[PDB]
Design a protein around this ligand. Structure first.
Ligand SMILES: O=C1CCNC(=O)N1
Ligand SMILES: O=C1CCNC(=O)N1
Lengths: 196, 196
């Protein structure tokens, strides 16, 4: 059995409901079917567990962007990235919300992950996208700002779901709304970067 | 209005630091240079004050969208809206962050503002943008999703500033970065909606 995974999943739900400071390791333990000491065998502190949870989300989010290669068809790759990001917003919204919460507080526990591994990845893949700009496979846009727009637009549907629901009546659990959302976000970003 | 303003601004800072539940009216009062009973002449409860803080940022955010009229040149109006939203992200980031925080928690106190006045505005201005779609002044996009993209892409630079800074080295207080940000967000969205 996958007790580490059960703890991570329980932690996500607890952290998302109570925040870092309000959350007690006893709450997570009980939710995951383990004792507090058992939990401490996998994660030596609440801090370590929290960082582990946010690393899970990062890996899920960044998987498609890691996969980008020079020889990929740029528009198709970016279309697919948008779709996959929206699937994450549909399937792991509480994680998206927790990551956002950490940013709102100034990234006190996650800053190192952003300045190190994230920055290095985005430099690498920005150069790759810049190469597509120079080839004329994309219109002249800044790679970093393109990336941020993908992140912001796709994560909005989870992080701002109450507002989305108030305005539209819907959520990403509605299959028709999910599809419309994918089509429109793709339409705007893709037509914005298509070479003319 | 100088005391009402001082209370609102003190409230923003206190709420941001301590959260809704941890904040006491006596903390805000002292930070604003007024007595608790003077504060209560302006705002009869902590809840009412919290909602007012978030109403300040709504009004600021929504001013350009309120101004939209049928006869406006659609691309120029949307370009300008994007710029103005980024100015707000530069100038009132802590308010953007508090509004985001309220959404992340499910909008427990702000829901009425969203279902009433906001929804009514967005319906009105979505119909107005739909009219521009039907005229051929914009490419066929969904108005609501366009609006959400403007919101998400512009608010990202405040709400996710630590990440933006980790990746780029910059903030919206850097004049060159601010200018690049405006240009690229406009480039992507405007080219995405330009009629072909
Ligand atoms: O996909 C991602 C990468 C990490 N940060 C972000 O906001 N979205
Ligand atoms: O621009 C806006 C106003 C409405 N709410 C929001 O998230 N941003």
């Amino acid at each position: 059995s996958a007790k580490k995974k059960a703890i991570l999943s329980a932690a996500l739900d607890t952290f998302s409901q109570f925040g870092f400071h309000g959350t007690r390791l006893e709450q997570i333990a009980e939710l995951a079917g383990v004792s507090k000491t058992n939990l401490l065998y996998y994660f030596p502190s609440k801090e370590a567990l929290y960082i582990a949870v946010l690393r899970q989300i990062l890996d899920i989010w960044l998987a498609p962007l890691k996969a980008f290669r020079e020889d990929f068809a740029p528009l198709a790759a970016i279309k697919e990235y948008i779709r996959l990001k929206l699937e994450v917003s549909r399937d792991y919204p509480q994680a998206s919300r927790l990551f956002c919460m950490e940013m709102l507080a100034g990234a006190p526990l996650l800053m190192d992950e952003l300045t190190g591994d994230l920055k290095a990845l985005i430099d690498e893949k920005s150069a790759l996208i810049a190469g597509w700009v120079k080839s004329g496979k994309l219109a002249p846009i800044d790679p970093q700002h393109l990336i941020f727009m993908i992140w912001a637009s796709t994560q909005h549907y989870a992080d701002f779901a109450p507002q989305v629901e108030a305005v539209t009546g819907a959520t990403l659990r509605d299959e028709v709304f999910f599809n419309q959302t994918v089509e429109n976000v793709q339409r705007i970003i893709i037509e914005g970067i298509r070479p003319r």
